[PDB]
Enzyme design. Structure first.
Site, PDB file in Angstrom:
ATOM      1  N   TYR A   1       0.736  -1.337   0.072  1.00 25.68           N
ATOM      2  CA  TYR A   1       0.185  -0.087  -0.093  1.00 25.68           C
ATOM      3  C   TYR A   1       0.977   1.091   0.040  1.00 25.68           C
ATOM      4  O   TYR A   1       1.225   1.942   1.072  1.00 25.68           O
ATOM      5  CB  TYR A   1      -0.929  -0.003   1.267  1.00 25.68           C
ATOM      6  CG  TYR A   1      -2.332   0.791   0.969  1.00 25.68           C
ATOM      7  CD1 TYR A   1      -2.288   1.997   0.549  1.00 25.68           C
ATOM      8  CD2 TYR A   1      -3.677   0.021   1.304  1.00 25.68           C
ATOM      9  CE1 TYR A   1      -3.443   2.650   0.507  1.00 25.68           C
ATOM     10  CE2 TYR A   1      -4.575   0.665   1.085  1.00 25.68           C
ATOM     11  CZ  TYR A   1      -4.701   1.981   0.804  1.00 25.68           C
ATOM     12  OH  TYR A   1      -6.043   2.832   0.426  1.00 25.68           O
TER      13      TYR A   1
ATOM     14  N   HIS B   1      -4.351  -0.425  -2.319  1.00 29.08           N
ATOM     15  CA  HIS B   1      -5.665   0.224  -2.596  1.00 29.08           C
ATOM     16  C   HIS B   1      -6.753  -0.232  -3.143  1.00 29.08           C
ATOM     17  O   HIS B   1      -8.024   0.155  -3.055  1.00 29.08           O
ATOM     18  CB  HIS B   1      -5.252   1.720  -3.077  1.00 29.08           C
ATOM     19  CG  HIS B   1      -4.768   1.627  -4.570  1.00 29.08           C
ATOM     20  ND1 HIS B   1      -3.658   1.127  -4.652  1.00 29.08           N
ATOM     21  CD2 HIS B   1      -5.320   1.851  -5.589  1.00 29.08           C
ATOM     22  CE1 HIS B   1      -3.400   1.311  -6.275  1.00 29.08           C
ATOM     23  NE2 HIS B   1      -4.588   1.458  -6.689  1.00 29.08           N
TER      24      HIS B   1
ATOM     25  N   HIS C   1     -13.419  -3.821   1.488  1.00 28.75           N
ATOM     26  CA  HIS C   1     -13.709  -3.870   3.052  1.00 28.75           C
ATOM     27  C   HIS C   1     -14.517  -5.048   3.234  1.00 28.75           C
ATOM     28  O   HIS C   1     -15.487  -5.294   2.348  1.00 28.75           O
ATOM     29  CB  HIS C   1     -14.370  -2.640   3.352  1.00 28.75           C
ATOM     30  CG  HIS C   1     -14.987  -2.674   4.789  1.00 28.75           C
ATOM     31  ND1 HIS C   1     -14.335  -2.558   5.972  1.00 28.75           N
ATOM     32  CD2 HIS C   1     -16.323  -3.175   5.356  1.00 28.75           C
ATOM     33  CE1 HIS C   1     -15.067  -2.844   6.972  1.00 28.75           C
ATOM     34  NE2 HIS C   1     -16.161  -3.020   6.504  1.00 28.75           N
TER      35      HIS C   1
ATOM     36  N   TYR D   1      -4.165  -4.755   7.423  1.00 30.97           N
ATOM     37  CA  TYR D   1      -2.958  -3.950   6.948  1.00 30.97           C
ATOM     38  C   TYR D   1      -1.860  -4.281   7.935  1.00 30.97           C
ATOM     39  O   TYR D   1      -2.017  -4.303   9.209  1.00 30.97           O
ATOM     40  CB  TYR D   1      -3.241  -2.624   6.792  1.00 30.97           C
ATOM     41  CG  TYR D   1      -4.443  -2.376   6.090  1.00 30.97           C
ATOM     42  CD1 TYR D   1      -4.423  -2.556   4.359  1.00 30.97           C
ATOM     43  CD2 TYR D   1      -5.754  -1.816   6.283  1.00 30.97           C
ATOM     44  CE1 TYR D   1      -5.389  -2.345   3.737  1.00 30.97           C
ATOM     45  CE2 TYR D   1      -6.635  -1.690   5.398  1.00 30.97           C
ATOM     46  CZ  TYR D   1      -6.468  -1.762   4.196  1.00 30.97           C
ATOM     47  OH  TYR D   1      -7.655  -1.641   3.346  1.00 30.97           O
TER      48      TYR D   1
ATOM     49  N   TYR E   1     -11.732  -2.073   7.102  1.00 36.71           N
ATOM     50  CA  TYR E   1     -11.292  -0.746   6.770  1.00 36.71           C
ATOM     51  C   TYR E   1     -11.307  -0.011   8.366  1.00 36.71           C
ATOM     52  O   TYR E   1     -10.507   0.872   8.688  1.00 36.71           O
ATOM     53  CB  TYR E   1     -12.115   0.086   5.950  1.00 36.71           C
ATOM     54  CG  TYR E   1     -12.161  -0.003   4.438  1.00 36.71           C
ATOM     55  CD1 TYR E   1     -11.002  -0.940   4.208  1.00 36.71           C
ATOM     56  CD2 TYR E   1     -12.509   0.709   3.437  1.00 36.71           C
ATOM     57  CE1 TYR E   1     -10.817  -1.330   2.583  1.00 36.71           C
ATOM     58  CE2 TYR E   1     -12.215   0.359   2.188  1.00 36.71           C
ATOM     59  CZ  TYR E   1     -11.376  -0.601   1.882  1.00 36.71           C
ATOM     60  OH  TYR E   1     -11.335  -0.694   0.562  1.00 36.71           O
TER      61      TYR E   1
HETATM   62  N1  LIG Z   1     -17.589  -3.932   1.084  1.00 32.75           N
HETATM   63  C1  LIG Z   1     -17.888  -2.881   0.311  1.00 32.75           C
HETATM   64  N2  LIG Z   1     -19.086  -2.544  -0.421  1.00 32.75           N
HETATM   65  C2  LIG Z   1     -19.083  -1.550  -1.459  1.00 32.75           C
HETATM   66  N3  LIG Z   1     -18.244  -0.838  -1.737  1.00 32.75           N
HETATM   67  C3  LIG Z   1     -16.953  -0.988  -1.494  1.00 32.75           C
HETATM   68  C4  LIG Z   1     -16.727  -2.034  -0.215  1.00 32.75           C
HETATM   69  N4  LIG Z   1     -15.366  -2.040  -0.099  1.00 32.75           N
HETATM   70  C5  LIG Z   1     -14.806  -1.129  -0.699  1.00 32.75           C
HETATM   71  N5  LIG Z   1     -15.647  -0.302  -1.577  1.00 32.75           N
HETATM   72  C6  LIG Z   1     -15.444   0.629  -2.484  1.00 32.75           C
HETATM   73  O1  LIG Z   1     -14.151   0.733  -2.746  1.00 32.75           O
HETATM   74  C7  LIG Z   1     -13.548   1.984  -2.144  1.00 32.75           C
HETATM   75  C8  LIG Z   1     -12.380   1.810  -1.491  1.00 32.75           C
HETATM   76  C9  LIG Z   1     -11.084   1.444  -2.326  1.00 32.75           C
HETATM   77  N6  LIG Z   1      -9.852   1.453  -1.642  1.00 32.75           N
HETATM   78  C10 LIG Z   1     -11.114  -0.003  -2.877  1.00 32.75           C
HETATM   79  C11 LIG Z   1     -10.935  -0.101  -4.308  1.00 32.75           C
HETATM   80  C12 LIG Z   1     -12.131   0.008  -5.365  1.00 32.75           C
HETATM   81  N7  LIG Z   1     -13.286  -0.915  -5.160  1.00 32.75           N
HETATM   82  C13 LIG Z   1     -11.646   0.510  -6.533  1.00 32.75           C
HETATM   83  O2  LIG Z   1     -12.472  -0.110  -7.606  1.00 32.75           O
HETATM   84  O3  LIG Z   1     -10.735   1.282  -6.770  1.00 32.75           O
HETATM   85  C14 LIG Z   1     -14.659   2.455  -1.442  1.00 32.75           C
HETATM   86  O4  LIG Z   1     -14.766   3.927  -1.390  1.00 32.75           O
HETATM   87  C15 LIG Z   1     -16.017   1.832  -2.257  1.00 32.75           C
HETATM   88  O5  LIG Z   1     -16.204   2.747  -3.290  1.00 32.75           O
HETATM   89  C1  LIG Z   2      -7.655   1.464   3.469  1.00 34.07           C
HETATM   90  N1  LIG Z   2      -8.512   2.478   4.010  1.00 34.07           N
HETATM   91  C2  LIG Z   2      -9.569   2.982   3.140  1.00 34.07           C
HETATM   92  C3  LIG Z   2     -10.464   4.041   3.605  1.00 34.07           C
HETATM   93  C4  LIG Z   2     -11.169   3.963   4.859  1.00 34.07           C
HETATM   94  C5  LIG Z   2     -12.389   4.165   5.606  1.00 34.07           C
HETATM   95  C6  LIG Z   2     -13.161   4.540   4.657  1.00 34.07           C
HETATM   96  C7  LIG Z   2     -13.001   6.100   3.764  1.00 34.07           C
HETATM   97  C8  LIG Z   2     -13.869   6.488   3.054  1.00 34.07           C
HETATM   98  C9  LIG Z   2     -15.089   5.824   2.599  1.00 34.07           C
HETATM   99  C10 LIG Z   2     -15.388   4.802   3.369  1.00 34.07           C
HETATM  100  C11 LIG Z   2     -14.508   4.155   4.246  1.00 34.07           C
HETATM  101  C12 LIG Z   2     -14.778   3.012   5.060  1.00 34.07           C
HETATM  102  C13 LIG Z   2     -14.575   2.783   6.599  1.00 34.07           C
HETATM  103  C14 LIG Z   2     -13.687   3.277   7.503  1.00 34.07           C
HETATM  104  C15 LIG Z   2     -13.739   3.108   8.981  1.00 34.07           C
HETATM  105  C16 LIG Z   2     -13.205   3.666   9.858  1.00 34.07           C
HETATM  106  O1  LIG Z   2     -13.457   3.530  11.363  1.00 34.07           O
HETATM  107  C17 LIG Z   2     -11.906   4.493   9.234  1.00 34.07           C
HETATM  108  C18 LIG Z   2     -11.606   4.455   8.225  1.00 34.07           C
HETATM  109  C19 LIG Z   2     -12.515   4.233   7.057  1.00 34.07           C
HETATM  110  C20 LIG Z   2      -9.715   3.507   6.082  1.00 34.07           C
HETATM  111  C21 LIG Z   2      -9.087   2.288   5.511  1.00 34.07           C
END
Ligand SMILES: Nc1ncnc2c1ncn2[C@@H]1O[C@H](C[C@@H](N)CC[C@H](N)C(=O)O)[C@@H](O)[C@H]1O
Ligand SMILES: CN1CCC(=C2c3ccccc3C=Cc3cc(O)ccc32)CC1
EC number: 2.1.1.364
Length: 247
Positions: free
Chosen positions: A131, A179, A183, A191, A221
């Site tokens: 990452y 990235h 989640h 991580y 996340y």
């Molecule tokens: N469990 C989930 N359900 C729905 N959307 C998700 C989930 N996990 C991650 N995402 C989406 O993925 C974003 C986070 C990214 N770091 C993950 C890669 C992203 N899916 C991409 O295509 O680039 C989030 O802001 C959501 O748009």
């Molecule tokens: C790998 N990272 C991806 C982004 C991330 C988010 C987050 C950010 C934007 C939209 C959604 C999320 C989702 C969950 C979240 C919950 C927390 O308690 C602290 C941070 C996050 C932290 C980990």
């Protein structure tokens, strides 16, 4: 007379070579070895900093001296720590260890976009992906819309790693892929800290359990009600409610 040193990092990577007069990892035959104890970047280092590492395989270590076989090709790497505005000197040069273990494809999670998948079956506690990203402050992340924070990952109390647009497209940035992992509250990965010869101090994705080939890699996340930023996405609200309903 001569002295070879093996430095093992907590993440499982290592640096090996003959130390110079000052006891420093400086020379033309120094190597970083990835956590598989096989994939190596071999070549010029100064005080442990990679100047020109060529992709190589660690074949054996007879009496402490490692034997490296250079991989055919011109894959060359250098220490290239990101800044607040520059993610990489070569955004399209992939990491060779990551390239053996993960790939990006459409997520199996509905509406999640792309996801990160295991290329091969691996055991528990296996580093899969790195990452890397630009390095910004918690203040910047906290002071903007959380819709801009989907690729943020806190590194420490000073630094947040981010992969901002347009680097969220693999056609624009594929030097690291951490990235792309989505989640889950039933994740198969975490991580973890990682000291990378090219990226410097970053995070990695490490498996919690054995994973099969083509399994989607997921990480929790967080567990707060809302992500960092101003004015939570509903997909996360729904999953958090389901998580909390189990206890
Ligand atoms: N469990 C989930 N359900 C729905 N959307 C998700 C989930 N996990 C991650 N995402 C989406 O993925 C974003 C986070 C990214 N770091 C993950 C890669 C992203 N899916 C991409 O295509 O680039 C989030 O802001 C959501 O748009
Ligand atoms: C790998 N990272 C991806 C982004 C991330 C988010 C987050 C950010 C934007 C939209 C959604 C999320 C989702 C969950 C979240 C919950 C927390 O308690 C602290 C941070 C996050 C932290 C980990």
């Amino acid at each position: 007379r001569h002295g070879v040193c093996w430095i093992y990092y907590p993440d499982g990577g290592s640096l090996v070579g003959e130390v110079n007069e000052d006891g420093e990892m400086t020379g033309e035959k120094i190597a970083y070895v990835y956590p598989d104890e096989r994939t190596a970047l071999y070549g010029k280092f100064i005080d442990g900093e990679m100047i020109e590492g060529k992709l190589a395989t660690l074949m054996s270590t007879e009496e402490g001296r490692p034997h490296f076989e250079l991989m055919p090709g011109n894959s060359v790497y250098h220490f290239d720590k990101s800044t607040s505005s520059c993610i990489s000197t070569n955004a399209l040069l992939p990491d060779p260890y990551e390239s053996e273990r993960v790939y990006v494809a459409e997520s199996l999670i509905s509406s999640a976009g792309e996801g990160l998948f295991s290329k091969v079956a691996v055991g528990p506690n296996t580093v899969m992906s790195f990452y890397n990203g630009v390095r910004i402050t918690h203040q910047e992340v906290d002071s903007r819309d959380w819709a801009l924070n989907g690729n943020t990952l806190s590194l420490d109390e000073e630094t947040v790693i981010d992969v901002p647009e347009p680097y969220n497209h693999v056609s624009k940035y594929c030097a690291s892929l951490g990235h792309k992992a989505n989640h889950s509250f039933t994740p198969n990965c975490i991580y973890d800290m990682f000291v990378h010869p090219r990226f410097g101090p970053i995070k990695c994705i490490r498996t919690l359990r054995a994973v099969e080939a083509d399994e989607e890699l997921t990480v929790a996340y967080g567990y707060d009600h809302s992500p960092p930023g101003k004015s939570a996405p509903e997909w996360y609200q729904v999953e958090l409610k389901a998580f909390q309903a189990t206890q």
